[PDB]
Structures are given as structure tokens and as C-alpha cells.
Symmetry: D8
Subunit: 62 residues, 16 copies
Amino acid sequence: SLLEKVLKEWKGHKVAVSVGFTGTLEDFDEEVILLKDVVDVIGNRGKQMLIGLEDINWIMLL
Amino acid sequence: SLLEKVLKEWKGHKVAVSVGFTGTLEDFDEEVILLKDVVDVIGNRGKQMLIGLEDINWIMLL
Amino acid sequence: SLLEKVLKEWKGHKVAVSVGFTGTLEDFDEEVILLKDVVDVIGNRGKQMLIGLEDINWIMLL
Amino acid sequence: SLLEKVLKEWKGHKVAVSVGFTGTLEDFDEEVILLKDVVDVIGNRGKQMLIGLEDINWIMLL
Amino acid sequence: SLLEKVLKEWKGHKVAVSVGFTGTLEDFDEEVILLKDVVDVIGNRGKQMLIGLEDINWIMLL
Amino acid sequence: SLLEKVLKEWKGHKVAVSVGFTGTLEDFDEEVILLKDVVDVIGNRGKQMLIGLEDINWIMLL
Amino acid sequence: SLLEKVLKEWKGHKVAVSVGFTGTLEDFDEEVILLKDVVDVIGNRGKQMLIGLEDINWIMLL
Amino acid sequence: SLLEKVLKEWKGHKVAVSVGFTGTLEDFDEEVILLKDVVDVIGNRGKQMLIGLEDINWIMLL
Amino acid sequence: SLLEKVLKEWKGHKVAVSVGFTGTLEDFDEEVILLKDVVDVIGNRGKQMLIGLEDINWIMLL
Amino acid sequence: SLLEKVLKEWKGHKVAVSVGFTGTLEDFDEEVILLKDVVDVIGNRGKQMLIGLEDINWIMLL
Amino acid sequence: SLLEKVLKEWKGHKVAVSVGFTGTLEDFDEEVILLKDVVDVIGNRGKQMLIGLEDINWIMLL
Amino acid sequence: SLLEKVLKEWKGHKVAVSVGFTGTLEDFDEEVILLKDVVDVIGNRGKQMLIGLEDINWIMLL
Amino acid sequence: SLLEKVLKEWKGHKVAVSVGFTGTLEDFDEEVILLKDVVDVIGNRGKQMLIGLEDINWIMLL
Amino acid sequence: SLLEKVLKEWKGHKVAVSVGFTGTLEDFDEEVILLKDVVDVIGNRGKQMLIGLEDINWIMLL
Amino acid sequence: SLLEKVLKEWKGHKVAVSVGFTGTLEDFDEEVILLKDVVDVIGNRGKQMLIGLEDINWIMLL
Amino acid sequence: SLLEKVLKEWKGHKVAVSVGFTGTLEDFDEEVILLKDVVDVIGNRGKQMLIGLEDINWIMLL
């Protein structure tokens, strides 16, 4: 998948995501992605974060 | 599933969840997750909470 | 099902439900839940209530 | 079917419905329910009313 | 079907319909209903009207 | 006042109103209008009705 | 005021109100109205109720 | 007023109005406009219509 | 299909349609319908118009 | 003010309020009201609560 | 007023406008502006158009 | 398909499309349509445009 | 002001505020309130916070 | 005014604006600002543009 | 696939997308498209961007 | 002015704003505030930013 290909490459890099938040992309598979070091514009938000691809509009590398 | 793997690791830890609240990820499976000691900002909300995964935006380990 | 198991456990007890109200979880199954003695922030609402699992956000035990 | 079982016992009695109205439950099956002598807060609403269960949030025995 | 049964009986009678209008129910099948003499509160609207059951919330006999 | 002048002549006659309902125009002044024998598409709506002109979009002689 | 005139006359009578509920109109002045015996379609709601004229769309006598 | 002048000019003529319909600009003033013989994409709507200038978006001459 | 039957009869006649405009039902099939001489209230809108049935609320013969 | 008069009488009694919660009307004046022992359906929400009148839809004595 | 100055210069030229359409800025004053040869994307919409400034987001010289 | 047939017919010609713009129907198939030389009420928008049939309301020929 | 008096009383203490967050009411006046050590259901949010009384729904003391 | 001061300085520079678009700020006064060379992400939009300060959320220098 | 065929030829060129952003089309397949050097009206938006075709309204060659 | 007093002390420090964005507080007065080196979650947003206090919900020292 172009999606597998790219997400492999993006693994390690800070990314922004639209669900309907930013942080480093720790891992992913066909149903979810997982983020480390998650921040909002005001501060840190959580060690990790799970998000399903179903509810994801776009992902963007920083 | 990265989902299974991660939730296993998160089991016991305080987590926040988005549907459309925070507590301890007591337990889970494919269809639902179960929170313990669910609080809101104002205070406690209730001894436990079931939540369907189909309506979960994102879960986040604090 | 974590859902069957926990619901078995909560039968008898007061619970809050968000659909899209609180009362005693009288009974349930794969499709619906039956509440008994239903209250609202203003007062009584009904001897009973049927609710489909499909349109429930979360059920919470008090 | 908890739903069937429960709907049997409510037949004859005044009930309330959230769809997306109150009146006596004439009949029901899998697809729809039929309400007799439907009423609004403001007054009557007409001899009968069909309602498909798909768009029903909850029903409630008064 | 309770729905077939009733709509047969309601055929001939003025009815109101919620799609997401009133007039006499001329005919129906599993996918549509057809109305004659359609009025709004301000006046007549159209000799006939087709409406699919998919987009119909409730039907009500007058 | 075109508004006064015109409302005089419509007094007695069935009218329609958009507020944010149809029935006979009993009376009016600067602040409100009074409608008699108010009607809905679905049926009657009650002996009378006050309506403040501020929230009225248009009125219409039928 | 046509509004004073009518509300005097309507005093005693059950009325419906649109704010943005029904019951008997116990009293009113230029800023508020007060209702006794307030009901919704499901049941009683409260001995009394205050409502400011600012947020009232229409009032209707039953 | 460019508004008075142009309205004087358009009296007699068909016009469309957006509030928040089309018909002949029968008359007008500082507060309202009176339309005569009012039509909708489906047909007639009313012998006449009153509309306040406050809630009109644009008036257009055809 | 009552739908097929009726649309056949309506073919040639001016019709109004709701999606989310009026003209002559030129032709149709299962997936779409085709309008000719499509006008709006303000005027003509265009020589023809295709419209998918899946997004049609109601069609109405004028 | 009927408002002053009534709120005086209601002072001490449990009341529900709409802004956009229930408790004891502890005290009030022109600009605000103060609730004591404010609960929601799920439980207690907080020792006290101020609320501006400008944003109050309706208050209701239970 | 920069507004007066600019609109003077724009008088005669094709302009687009946002309220909540494009044509020639025929004329204007404090309360309103007047467009000539108002077209939309699909075609012509009407000989002229008045528009109140209070409801204008932005005007733009093409 | 009435859709294939009519689209074959409209290839070459200017058309308006509502999604959820106007230009020449350059080409199309079962899934998408390709527009060439795309215009908006304010001006040009693009050398070309791809659009999925799924999210089109109506296509109209000018 | 019931508002001044009660705010004097609550200075020092944790409070929840709804605007359109919780923290210590550090200080206040006729126009605004200053919060210190601000928390959200997920965690810290800021050393401090300013908020205008105009856009506050309710302030509540915990 | 801090607002006069800054807008003087920003005159000449490309800016973005939120009304409820970007280009160079040609001039301004207490009621409006005027933009030259206005672009959207897709292309140019208009030689100039007027926008009233009333409907402007923020302005931002680039 | 008109979609495939057309996307090939646009590869390398700056494009615009409506999702629910502009930049060079790096690659694509059935499930997603990849945009390089993504840009906002206000400025850059980050090295790359994945977008799933499901939530794409239209794409547009500039 | 608590507002003035407090804004003085925050000048120089990174702050967050809800309007209807974060960056260093350059200056302020009654009508507006000026933010320097404005930032988004996704990245920079431009040298400076004016914001009128009217549409500001809260400001927050980080």
C-alpha cells in the first residue's frame, strides 16, 4: 500500500493528524496508529495516543 | 493488533478517552472497554464505565 | 463478551446511560437494555425504558 | 427477544418514544411499532402512528 | 408485515409524513409511498408526491 | 404605518406567519399580534396565539 | 398593551410556551410570566416555572 | 435614500426577496414591504405578504 | 415498482424535486432522473439536469 | 417585580435552572442567582454555583 | 470614509459581494448598495439588486 | 445507463456541478468526472478537476 | 452585588468555570476573573488565566 | 490606538484576515480595511477587497 | 481508470484538494494520495501529506 | 483594571488565546492585543497578530 510504504517511512517523525493533535508516530497498522509525546498548542497532552484510521481525515509530516 | 498490544500495556494506567472523562483502563476487548474510577474535571462521575469502540475517537494514556 | 460479563455484574444496580437519564439496570441482551424506575435531574420519568445498544454512547455504574 | 417479551407486556399501555410524541401501544414487530391515540404536549396528533424501530432512540412505559 | 397490514388499511385516508407535508395516501410498496392532494399549511402543493421509505421518520393517520 | 394600514385590512382573514402556523388575525399593535383559531398542517393548535413582531419574518394574507 | 390585555384574560387558562413546556398561567408582568402545574408530554415537571419574555417566541392558549 | 429612490422605481414590478419567494412590489416604507401575488418554485403562496426590512438580505428586480 | 409505474405516468409533466428546482421529467431509470427546462423561482437554470435517486428526498408532480 | 416576589418565596427550596443542573436557591439579586448543593443526574457537582440572569432561560421550582 | 472613496472608484466596475452573486456596482450610499446585471455562476439572476451594508461581509472589485 | 447515455451526450459542453463550480465536461466514467477549464462566480479556478460521482448532488447542462 | 460578595467569599478556593476548565480563583473585578493554577480533565493548562464576565455561563465552587 | 499604530506599520505588508483570504493591506480607517492583490490558496481572487472591522476576528501579518 | 489515467498526468504538478490545502502531487493509489510541499493560504504546512480518497470531494490541477 | 494590571505582568511571556493560536504578548490596550511570533500546533503562523478583546474568550499565561 502507498499507505503502508509511507507510514513506514514517517515512523520516527513528528506528525499532525486530523480526526473528524500532534506528536511522534511510534507505530501503526491497517486499523490504528499510535503516537508518542503528544502535544497541543498549550502544552503536552499524553505519553501516548491511539487513533483509528476510520476517523482520520489526513496525516501530515512535519 | 497494535490495539490489543497497547491496551494490554495500558491496562491499569489512567487513560483519557474521546467519544463524540478519564479513568483507569480496567479491562477491554474487541467491542468495548471498561474504565474504573471515572472522573471528570469537576469530580467523580461513577464507579465504572463501559464504552463501545465503534464510537471512540481516540484513547490516550496519560 | 466483556459486555455480557459486566452487564451480568451490573444487573440490579443503578446506572447512567447516554443515548445520542439514569435508572436501575433491570435487564438486557445483545440488542437492548431494560431500565426500571427512571429518573431525570428534575424527577421521575417512567416505570420502565427500552434502549438499543446501537445508539448508546456509554453506560456507567454509580 | 427481550425486546419482543417486553413489548408484549407494554401493549395496551400509554408509552413515550424518542424518534430522531406519546400514545398507547397498539402493536409492533421487528420493523415497526404502531401507536394509537397519539398525543402531543399541545394536544392530539391523530388516530394512529407508525414508527420504524431503526430511528427509535428509546421507548418508555409510563 | 405490520407495515404492509397498516398501510393497506390507511390507504384512502389523509396522512402526515416526516421525511428527515400532508395528503391522502394513494398507494405504497416496500420502497415508496405515493400521496394525492398534497397540502402544506399555506395551501395546496401538488397533484401527487413520491417519497421513499428510507428517508421517512414516521407516518401518521388523520 | 404601511404595517398598521395593511394589518387593519387583513383583520378577520386567515393569515400565515413565519416566526424564527396559520390562523385568523384577531388583533395587533406595535409589540404583538394575536391569532385566533390557530392551525397546524397536522390539525388544530389551540384557541389563540400571541406573537411578538420582533421574531416575525413575514406575515401573509391567504 | 394588546399583550397586557390578553395575558390578563389568559390568566387562569392552560397555555403552551416556546422559549427559543406547558402549564397554567399563574401570573405575569412586563419582564416575566409564571406558570403553575407544569407538564411535559411524559409527565409533570414542576410546581412552578419562571420564564422571561425576552426569550419567548410565542404563547398559545389551550 | 438610495433605498427609497430605487424602491419608488421598482413599485409595480416583480421582485425576488431573500429573508433570513418572489412577487410584485405592491408597496413599501421605512419599516416594511408589501408584496402582491406571491409565488414559490412550486406555485402560488398568497394574495399578499408583509416583510420587515430588518430581516431582508437582498431584494432583486427581475 | 410503484416508482417505475408512476414516473412513467409523470414523464413529460412538470415536476418539482427535493435533494438535500423544478422542470419537466424528461426521462429516468433506477440510478438517476433527467429534467428538462429546469427553472428556479428567479428564472431558468439550465437546459437539462441529471439527479441521482439515492439523494432524492421526494419528487412531486405539479 | 413578580420575579423578586417569586424568588423570595422560592428561596430555600430546591429549584432546577436552564442556561444555554439543580440545587437549592440559596440567594439572588438582579444580576445573578446563587445555588447551594448543586447536583446533576449522576451526582453532586459542587458546593455552590453563581449564575447570571441574562443567560437564564427558565427557572423552575420543583 | 475610505469606504466612500473606494466605492466611488469602483462605481461602474464589476464587483463580487458576500452577504451571509456578482454584478456592476451601479450605485450606493450609507445604508445600501445597488448592483446591475447581477449574474451567478449558472447565469443571470436579475436586472438589479439592492443590498444592505449591515449584512455585507466583504465587497470585492474583480 | 441513462447516466452513461446522457453523459456521452454532454461531453464537450459546459456544465454546472454541485458537490456536497462550472466547466466543460472533458470526460467521465463509472466512478468520476473530469472537468476542463473551471470557473467560479469570481473567475478561473483550474486547468482541470476530478470529481467522484458519489459526492455529486446534480449535474446540469447549460 | 451578590456577585462581589460571593466572589470575595470564594477567593482562595478552587472553582469550575464554563465559558461559552477549573482552577483557583486568584482574583477578580467587574469585568474579569483571574484564575491561578489551571487544570483540565487531562492535566495542567496554565500558570494563569484571564476571563471576562460577559462570556461566562456559570462559576461553581468545589 | 494600538490598532491605528499597528495598522499604519502593517500598511504595505501582506496580511491574512479572518472575517467570521489574504493580500496586501493598501489602507484602512476606524470602520474598514482595504486589500490589494487578494489571493486564496487556489489563485488570485480580486484586484481589491473591502472588509469592515465589525466582522473581523483577527488580522495577521506575514 | 479515468482516475488512474488522469492522476498519472497530474503527478509532479501543483494541485488543490477539498477534503471534508494545496501542494505537489507526489503519488497515489486506490486508497490514498500523497502530497509534497503542502501549503496553506497563510504559509507552509509541512513536508508531506497523506490523504485517503474516501474523504476527498475534488482534486484540481492548477 | 485587573485586566490592565495583569496584562502588564504577562507582557513578554508566551500566552494562549481563545478567539471565537499562541505566541508572545507584544502589547495591548482596551480595544486590542498584539501577539508576536504567533504559532500554531502545526507550525508558525506569521510575524504578528492583532486581536480585538471583544471576540476573546480567555487569555492564558503559559
